[PDB]
């Protein structure tokens, strides 16, 4: 990646890069606002838009999808990216667009789905789609949500909140939970999500914060792990990430803790 | 549109 970010070292990705693992032959669908494929630093292998007012998945009028695409490649430089536009320029989307993106990812044999998006109430139809994706063997990763805390209540957003989906919270460069990072027993792992520098539309770069930035560190880590263990199932990849995480404190705030892709890749 | 970028 052309923009330096602490987050790649923080999850111990350089150790795997040094071993020769960069996520070769792994298909990662970015279900987001698009990917600006004109970025000199991003190669997008294919895609689809399901946003009827925004018909080009290879442009990004929001900036999130391009940023997230860059983070996946910063962690897994050889991953194959797919731009699946399910959110419009305002970063908002309908359940149906998301389902269409999940179904496209199944039909096109994606290895990993990243969904840096959430709703507070969720959708039974989205649940059926993500569960189908996971049953078909896709690693499904989502942002845990930016809804902070609510006493003893879970604030994890949908679809992260569903058991089939890996819910990723955000830490800063000091491994402290970001104040915005959602919490609850559904939180699975943490990754870097504060002031992450990555690709922006119009050939730009810049820092963004959110569980949206934490999720692609884990999507990229899944790509690294599959490159070292191409025969592993999604269940095995998920188990590896959860079972080898660095514990950071109470699981309500931190889940299993910070992903350690060096440890997870065995 | 209840889903938002995170
Ligand atoms: Cl949902
Ligand atoms: Na979940």
Numbering used by the authors:
A (entry chain S): 1 to 74, 84 to 275
B (entry chain B): 275 to 280
The authors write:
The engineering process to develop specificity for the RAS sequence QEEYSAM involved extensive modification of the Bacillus protease, subtilisin BPN’16–24, a canonical serine protease in which the scissile peptide bond is attacked by a nucleophilic serine (S221). To generate high specificity for the RAS target sequence, the active site was modified to be dependent on a cofactor (imidazole or nitrite) and protease sub-sites were engineered to create a linkage between substrate and cofactor binding.
To understand the structural basis for specificity and cofactor activation, we determined crystal structures of RASProtease(I) alone, in complex with YSAM and QEEYSAM product peptides, and with imidazole. An additional interesting feature of the structure of RASProtease(I) with QEEYSAM was the presence of an acyl adduct between the C-terminus of the P1 Met of the peptide and the Oγ of S221 of the enzyme. Apparently, the binding energy of the QEEYSAM peptide is sufficient to push its terminal carbon and Oγ of S221 into an orientation that drives the equilibrium from a product complex to the acyl enzyme. In particular, for the fully engineered RAS-specific proteases described here, binding of the cognate QEEYSAM sequence results in structural changes that are transmitted from the binding pockets to the active site and enable cofactor activation. Binding of the cognate substrate with a P4 tyrosine rescues the active conformation, however, by supplying stabilizing interactions in the S4 pocket that are transmitted to the catalytic region and promote productive binding of cofactor. Structures with a cognate peptide bound show that the L135V mutation allows space for an adventitious ion-binding site that coordinates the hydroxyl group of the P4 tyrosine of the substrate. This stabilizing interaction may be an important element for rescuing the active conformation of the catalytic region and enabling strong cofactor activation.
